[PDB]
Scaffold this active site. Structure first.
Site, PDB file in Angstrom:
ATOM      1  N   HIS A  29     -11.456  -8.293  41.136  1.00 15.36           N
ATOM      2  CA  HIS A  29     -10.634  -8.116  40.059  1.00 15.36           C
ATOM      3  C   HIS A  29     -12.256  -8.030  38.706  1.00 15.36           C
ATOM      4  CE1 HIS A  29     -10.415  -9.658  35.508  1.00 15.36           C
ATOM      5  NE2 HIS A  29      -9.941  -8.888  35.628  1.00 15.36           N
ATOM      6  N   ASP A  30     -11.929  -6.611  38.297  1.00 15.12           N
ATOM      7  CA  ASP A  30     -13.390  -5.879  37.087  1.00 15.12           C
ATOM      8  C   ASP A  30     -14.239  -6.084  38.165  1.00 15.12           C
ATOM      9  OD1 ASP A  30     -12.542  -5.574  34.874  1.00 15.12           O
ATOM     10  OD2 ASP A  30     -12.214  -7.666  33.868  1.00 15.12           O
ATOM     11  N   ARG A  66     -12.401  -0.850  35.057  1.00 13.81           N
ATOM     12  CA  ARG A  66     -11.756  -1.001  33.892  1.00 13.81           C
ATOM     13  C   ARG A  66     -13.216  -0.383  33.284  1.00 13.81           C
ATOM     14  NH1 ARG A  66      -7.445  -5.150  34.237  1.00 13.81           N
ATOM     15  NH2 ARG A  66      -7.472  -5.832  36.553  1.00 13.81           N
ATOM     16  N   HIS A  79     -15.955  -5.209  31.007  1.00  8.77           N
ATOM     17  CA  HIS A  79     -14.191  -6.198  30.363  1.00  8.77           C
ATOM     18  C   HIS A  79     -13.845  -5.815  29.187  1.00  8.77           C
ATOM     19  CE1 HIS A  79     -12.559  -9.610  31.264  1.00  8.77           C
ATOM     20  NE2 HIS A  79     -12.732 -10.510  30.515  1.00  8.77           N
ATOM     21  N   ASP A 280     -11.606 -12.998  41.335  1.00  7.47           N
ATOM     22  CA  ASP A 280     -12.498 -13.361  41.217  1.00  7.47           C
ATOM     23  C   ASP A 280     -13.616 -13.632  42.191  1.00  7.47           C
ATOM     24  OD1 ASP A 280     -11.930 -12.444  38.397  1.00  7.47           O
ATOM     25  OD2 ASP A 280     -11.608 -14.595  37.472  1.00  7.47           O
TER      26      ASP A 280
END
Length: 302
Positions: A29-30, A66, A79, A280
């Site tokens: 994630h990210d 992102r 983020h 994460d």
């Protein structure tokens, strides 16, 4: 021995006749927030500590990028409002490097606009991406460019597959690569058809959940995949949540509890279908606890 013992090339050990959807893939994630050093800002905006190459070497194949249009020709990795200190080219160059060294892996790259463009930008995020990255001669042959709505490992290995979270696009290859794009529900477990109705996408993205509810929501979608052998169904299951500005549960704290809880659950399910699980601190180990990346990988039956 387990595929998880060689994460640098675990997809090389699968039947490449499989559709990527059928493959159990660990995601980060990210992904690009490993660059964050500010202690205060890192509590709620830092989601990873390993760089792109190390993540790949640890067996991550789904990258959650992102971003924000910084110039008419530049997408910065973000983020939310927080700039992550690099542009998209950095990740593309690392991917191109890794894929060259490990040519029978594929990378699924998710692409989303996380923040408002720079006041000087005159282009849409999608247009910038399509023109200055996807169709850029520099990244020639890097992306999957085929016309299979449900591509196979053979068809994609050595390449990055676009997972389109930009809205409607004129890009014609990858997941949600049409003028409709992917209808993404906010903070929800949801189901929507993508690629002209070719695929049924099932997402758990309740990123505001408190702990107990989050585990329940991950487990709910985890259970469904287990008994779902349909290759036209694709599962994306986020274990991550927003920390918020202040509190006791730094993304690292949250991760240190959920990641092992799901890893342990996957391990007990044996070689059952999980979907694509996005976490994460991918590749981060806590002594005494099961490793989520390792168990996602091992859950694939060869």
């Amino acid at each position: 021995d387990s595929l998880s013992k060689s994460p640098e090339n675990w997809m090389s050990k699968l039947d490449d006749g499989k559709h990527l959807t059928e493959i159990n893939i660990p995601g980060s994630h990210d992904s690009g927030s490993f660059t964050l050093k500010d202690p205060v800002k890192s509590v709620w905006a830092k989601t990873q500590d390993k760089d792109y190459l190390t993540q790949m070497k640890s067996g991550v194949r789904f990258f959650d990028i992102r971003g924000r249009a910084s110039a008419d020709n530049m997408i910065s990795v973000h983020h939310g409002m927080v700039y992550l200190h690099h542009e998209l080219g950095k990740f593309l160059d690392d991917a191109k490097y890794y894929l060259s060294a490990y040519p029978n892996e594929t990378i699924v790259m998710s692409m989303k606009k996380d923040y408002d463009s720079d006041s000087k930008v005159t282009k849409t995020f999608e247009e910038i991406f399509r023109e200055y990255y996807y169709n850029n001669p520099q990244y020639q042959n890097l992306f999957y460019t085929g016309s299979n709505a449900n591509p196979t490992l053979k068809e994609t290995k050595g390449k990055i597959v676009l997972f389109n979270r930009m809205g409607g696009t004129y890009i014609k290859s990858g997941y949600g690569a049409d003028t409709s794009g992917i209808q993404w529900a906010d903070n929800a477990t949801f189901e929507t058809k993508i690629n002209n109705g070719s695929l049924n996408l099932k997402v758990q993205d309740e990123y505001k959940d408190y702990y107990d509810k989050k585990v329940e929501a991950v487990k709910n979608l985890l259970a469904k995949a287990k008994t779902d052998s349909n290759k036209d169904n694709v599962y994306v299951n986020f274990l991550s949540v927003a920390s918020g500005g202040s509190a006791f549960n730094s993304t690292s704290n949250y991760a240190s509890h959920i990641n092992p809880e799901i890893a342990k659950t996957i391990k007990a399910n044996g070689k059952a279908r999980t979907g694509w699980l996005i976490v994460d601190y991918a590749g981060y180990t806590w002594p005494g606890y099961d490793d989520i990346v390792s168990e996602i990988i091992d859950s694939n039956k060869l």
